[PDB]
Amino acid sequence: REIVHIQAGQCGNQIGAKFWEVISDEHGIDPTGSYHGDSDLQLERINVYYNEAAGNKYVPRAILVDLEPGTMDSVRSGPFGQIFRPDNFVFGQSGAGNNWAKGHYTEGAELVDSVLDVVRKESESCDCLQGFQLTHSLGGGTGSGMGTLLISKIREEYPDRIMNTFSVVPSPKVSDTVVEPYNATLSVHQLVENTDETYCIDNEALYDICFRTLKLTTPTYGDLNHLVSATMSGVTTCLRFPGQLNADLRKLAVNMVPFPRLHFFMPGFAPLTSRGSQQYRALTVPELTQQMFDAKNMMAACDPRHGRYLTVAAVFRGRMSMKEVDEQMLNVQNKNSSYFVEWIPNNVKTAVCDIPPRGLKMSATFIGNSTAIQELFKRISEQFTAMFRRKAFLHWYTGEGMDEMEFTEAESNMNDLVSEYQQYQD
Amino acid sequence: RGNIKVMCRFRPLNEAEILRGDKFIPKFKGEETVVIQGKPYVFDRVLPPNTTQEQVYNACAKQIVKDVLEGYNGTIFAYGQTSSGKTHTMEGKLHDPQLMGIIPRIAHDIFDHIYSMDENLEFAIKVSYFEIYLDKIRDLLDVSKTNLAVHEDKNRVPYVKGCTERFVSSPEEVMDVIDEGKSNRHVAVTNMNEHSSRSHSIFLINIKQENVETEKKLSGKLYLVDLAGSEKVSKTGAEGAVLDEAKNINKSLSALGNVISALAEGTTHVPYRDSKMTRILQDSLGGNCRTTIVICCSPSVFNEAETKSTLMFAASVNSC
Amino acid sequence: RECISIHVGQAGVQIGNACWELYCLEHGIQPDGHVPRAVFVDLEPTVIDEVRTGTYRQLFHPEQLITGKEDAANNYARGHYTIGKEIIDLVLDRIRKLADQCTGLQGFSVFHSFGGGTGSGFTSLLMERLSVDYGKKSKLEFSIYPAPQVSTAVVEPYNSILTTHTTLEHSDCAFMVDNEAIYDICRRNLDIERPTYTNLNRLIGQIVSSITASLRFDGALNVDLTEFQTNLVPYPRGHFPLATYAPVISAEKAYHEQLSVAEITNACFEPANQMVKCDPRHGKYMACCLLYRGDVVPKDVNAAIATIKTKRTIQFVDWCPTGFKVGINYEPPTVVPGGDLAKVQRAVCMLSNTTAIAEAWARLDHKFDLMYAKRAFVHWYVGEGMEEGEFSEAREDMAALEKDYEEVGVDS
């Protein structure tokens, strides 16, 4: 099987560097080097993310889409930056304006064809394609607009292969941009209707989880990114490993989406202990479920405790008892019968790889489909209206060839999306 | 106006089905129940072979037409497998007065209200015809418009913008428009006689009126939906473009079933977002007239299997 | 004489590698000896690959190892219809190419995992295409039906109410081994909270060895495969008996091993030792096939069983005078060199049809409804060449399996 990553925008891009920083080491691939793999198993399934050309050069099969040179020229001028074949860099030296409209209708719409071109060169690579990974932020141009287009096109070209989306939904407390809800509401819209698996991460849900669950005092972006990339590795790549009970994107999809919206999840990693001290090793297993299922530790902003779950997928990856795994999951399902929805006898989807995260003994990625994420699109949707009402920075959109009915559309859509999700919380 | 109703229609055995000797397997009950070996059944109305085109129209479509002429919305769905009686029920002998189906009658009644009101009223009849094929909205009136979008109205309710609207001033103009669109419809042919349609069809009749003296305007929407039958892909053995077609037809019928079931149980949440079809019809299901689902069945051993499935599609009627 | 086997689904393949291991182990045929007599099917390469990479690597022909690089999908539909279809032909070909090479066979021991994608769906049509191509044989499918509370897949029931209805009208005798109810045995009758899947497999890998292996092997009271279905199914429903083993003692902890027949047989009817969460909560047995192996005196049996026939609290069906097929083999069991299985010199792999499953099916059917009641993951199948039909019409199916397993018992 296979997949083809997609680094839309700067963020989605910045993260690319971290997702590939990791994944590679979790596959023994040095900058341009080959497979130094401490083992021999980190190779029989690599294909999922690379391509064979030389014999020591397995190149990441991702796409780097962005209308701001400097960015990709920071990712390509640093560490692992020199492993992507230049063909991968689909830049847009234009003005990468922070407008969803500027990267979806006017500026991005041009650079698109020169992207799809490659997304096809990579898809028609070899063997059988599974789906595409998509990273980006719903709070900017090259991210929400142009990346949200990249998919609307992808999903027309292969409505068969899957589409996981890793979105950095606009954090609450403080917005790292101003129109944010504009660029956001507009991209979520496109998401709820193309990709079929979305993993929403919040820069501040991370800080928290990174400053209190990792006594880490100076959580640089690199970190946040790093933590995130840690989860997306547990998801995909991982399951493309052996296991007593293994799954793969689809299983994950076909066990997690009760209703076609596409629904968004909230990823959570397992061993998340501070370096030295904490290295408690309390990782027998009840310790991992202890972790994963708590409020804090959910990369999302919202707290599960604020709304039932529809599905859950503990994708563990480290030798354990299909008994102490299958078992724990249960008590968990009974101690919290309250929030776990009922019309699904077994919400949880236990998954079990074998080999764990390179240096760790036992981990377990968590992919939750809780109704709690209602209380986020609400947020976003609110911010919109409060500012849409006055058409705040709307001239930067319309003046870029947009529509007063376009914004209406998205909000509503994504706004209805909130509605539905409640239809199950009850 | 405004409960949903499903109506079953059994056609007579044709010249073709008699030699085999298929014995009467359906033992009708009352005027609402049909017993075939199964679970117990019941529908809003069951029309036998003896039931006229006039009797069928009055019970299933006549009230919806009056509501549309009064400015309200209404929807008529027609469902059935191949050789069930969809064509005969919905159109029949298009120009013959007795043999004509449902659509020429709706169009007859509309133009009989029109003309009869020429005193202070100004009427405009706008028609639209599109098919949903491979999850794409294809205009059947403009072959260039193969992938078409919704936008939202004044209330934030979606509507199909850009749908080729055709102005129609007579009953014959409507029939000619249906014929033009049918020639653009995604049909498949097993044998030359058979007409499988791999797409759902939606015909829109918008009755617009302006009271010149009162200055008040009305716009009633009548949706005529032609449903392709559910396909068991294991049987047929679809593949490539066929298997993708069969999955798409099946998905859409599930979505539709989920939507009508939700509305039947007067549930707060109605899953219109399950399909593009349910979203096109959202305003005309939602808060409107007496949606009627007309399900066509074959009697005999020819179709106890496909007949059964045709009735199971309709499982939302009156629940409970 | 023989009995081919088709291990379908990752699980059916893991269990397969296991049951297949125990085999050579008690036949003196190391890694590279003769040639198996089965096949391996899966729509996820990486798993069958484990049989291509790991142990018992060269004991198979890359021809009896079928894979569909494509996608597994934990959904019946896709595995049965859409995808699973493409492979079937090829699959069959082997069970027609391997079925020819032999000499007057008896049937195909099928190994699948009820609630999976490749295991539920696929087989559904595999067994399906068999019942027609060889209606004149035995179709005993050895299943691992859904843990009563510890299921895995979110949809599981969708996949298991569908593999039951499609296979029902095609199997001869369906053996059942409950994944969870086996853990209990690993906790309560062997002590270990560290049971790897690789263990449950060693277990069924045992109970199964008692079925085919040793039975098709000479003895003092041979029992052919046909024998089963005959002495085991009272009615055409591909009736599902339950597998049970007796000396499930730990090869470390306790040691009373020397547990004469009189004991090991009583240890079969206590509900805490039956590889199935179908505790005889009321289910009246209606036929049991006590397969013994090792040093056993026929009188010991034709007495140990007599004592049972008169315990009454073990209530057998009415319409059944005597329902005890005593199968005696010679060669004692053969435990893994150093797993965790005791290693006695006699065992009792008793399987049976019990009005008990009236439960297990019930509890699994109910599940289904809850979700179907909301369509839950329905769009995942529809979009895979299925319909409101196959579900609703396979639900009604089992319904008459809840009435069936009710009527054939509870009444006199």
Ligand SMILES: CC(=O)O[C@H]1C(=O)[C@@]2(C)[C@H]([C@H](OC(=O)c3ccccc3)[C@]3(O)C[C@H](OC(=O)[C@H](O)[C@@H](NC(=O)c4ccccc4)c4ccccc4)C(C)=C1C3(C)C)[C@]1(OC(C)=O)CO[C@@H]1C[C@@H]2O
């Ligand atoms: C001596 C030793 O055991 O060191 C550990 C360690 O101290 C801890 C604290 C690690 C450490 O992780 C962090 O400090 C961290 C920094 C930024 C963002 C997020 C986390 C570690 O850096 C991370 C590193 O993780 C891995 O090696 C995994 O394979 C992981 N790899 C990466 O994230 C990665 C990092 C740099 C370059 C390439 C990849 C992974 C996880 C999931 C999926 C794929 C890969 C591990 C175990 C450790 C160190 C090295 C200190 C922890 O994190 C992970 C992801 O394992 C933090 O809490 C856990 C518990 C670990 O015990």
Ligand SMILES: Nc1nc2c(ncn2[C@@H]2O[C@H](COP(=O)(O)OP(=O)(O)OP(=O)(O)O)[C@@H](O)[C@H]2O)c(=O)[nH]1
């Ligand atoms: N006893 C036993 N049960 C197993 C084993 N492996 C899996 N199972 C069980 O069988 C089911 C798992 O099926 P999967 O592995 O998900 O799927 P599959 O049937 O191989 O086919 P796919 O869904 O297409 O991958 C679960 O109920 C597991 O508990 C095993 O080695 N032994």
Ligand SMILES: Nc1nc2c(ncn2[C@@H]2O[C@H](COP(=O)(O)OP(=O)(O)O)[C@@H](O)[C@H]2O)c(=O)[nH]1
């Ligand atoms: N986690 C994370 N967030 C980022 C990174 N870079 C920008 N962001 C977030 O992305 C939003 C800004 O959008 P930006 O990426 O600049 O848009 P674009 O570059 O015009 O497509 C803010 O909410 C930031 O917090 C990053 O490297 N990691």
Ligand SMILES: [Mg+2]
């Ligand atoms: Mg598998």
